[model samples]
Target: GPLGSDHIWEQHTVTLHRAPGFGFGIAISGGRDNPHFQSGETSIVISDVLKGGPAEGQLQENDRVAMVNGVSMDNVEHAFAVQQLRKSGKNAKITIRRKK
Candidate 1:
């Protein structure tokens, strides 16, 4: 079998829509060793939630982000994840999961 052909990764996606001149208020933390790293699933975790931020009540802390705008984060770091979200512009879809 080819690479990734024998594996199944679940996806949890959410779209964040903001009006003109608005922004999403969400912060994330977690990397090499933060107690949230899982084998084959090194996605980062949501560390902060700003009040009145775009993600105020939508995105919660400790959520494991898997992708941004359909771009997989399995092979990238936390900074890149933030970059991807920025590159996604005003409207974007984020895939995430809660800790088990």
Candidate 2:
């Protein structure tokens, strides 16, 4: 059976968006169960840091993200987390969970 013949109507897509140098970037969190923030245990982790971006200036890969722009991020979905941070505008304050 051909690929399209199986489930052509069933939609599957991949979208690409860029920050455009000075434009807002795609933010992100770990996943669900991390939207409001908590203590002791880390919620989100910073996997990548785009060089020269707001986060790149102050953040590093493997940094556990806790909050964005003072908004506590606990049970956060990856896509939703990106929305939360992007809404904060170009520059955002991101608090991370660091090791001792």
Candidate 3:
């Protein structure tokens, strides 16, 4: 595996409290062309995290959003997932996965 073809993606999960106005203090996006997105698979990426946000120190940039509230997002669309997160209420569980 000269190019490390055997390398695998690592997954991470964290639960954060969502506060009004503050939210998670992160910017997220998901789509077919996104690096984190795969054929027939849907996921979102944490493009950026704002300072003092609830997700600060808990989540990082380029982190993939694989799940929310313990539900599998393998088939969920990006915009819909984001909408779900906005309506997911306080104390949500987020699962992320990344390689490198």
On lDDT, the candidate that comes out on top is: 3
Candidate 3 lDDT by residue in tens digits, 1-100 = 2357665777887877787776855666665444465665565667677757678766665456677667666666556666766775677667887665
Among all windows of 10 consecutive residues in model 1, the one with the lowest summed lDDT is 1-10
What TM-score goes with each of the models? 0.65, 0.55, 0.67
Alpha carbon deviation, residue 54, candidate 1 (Å): 2.7
Q: What is the lDDT of residue 67 in candidate 3?
A: 77
Indicate which candidate wins on TM-score: 3
Clashing pairs in 3: none
Clashing pairs in 1: none
What does candidate 2's lDDT look like per residue over 43-81, in tens digits?
Answer: 556555566544444444444566655655565666666
Evaluation by TM-score, superior candidate among 2 and 3: 3
| Local distance difference test, each candidate | 0.66, 0.50, 0.67
Better of 1 and 3 by TM-score: 3
Give me the overall lDDT of model 2.
0.50
